[PDB]
Curated annotation (Swiss-Prot):
Protein modification: Elastase might be responsible for its maturation.
Sequence similarity: Belongs to the cathelicidin family.
Tissue specificity field: Large granules of neutrophils.
Function: Potent microbicidal activity; active against S.aureus and E.coli.
Residues included from the entire protein: 131 to 143 of 144
Places the protein is found: Secreted
Source species of the chain: Bos taurus (Bovine)
Modified residue annotations for Arginine amide: R13
Domain of life assignment: Eukaryota
Protein name stated in the entry: Cathelicidin-4
Amino acid sequence: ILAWKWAWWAWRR
């Protein structure tokens, strides 16, 4: 379950 603050910047794209 290591992941969450990463998908963020992925949305901005």
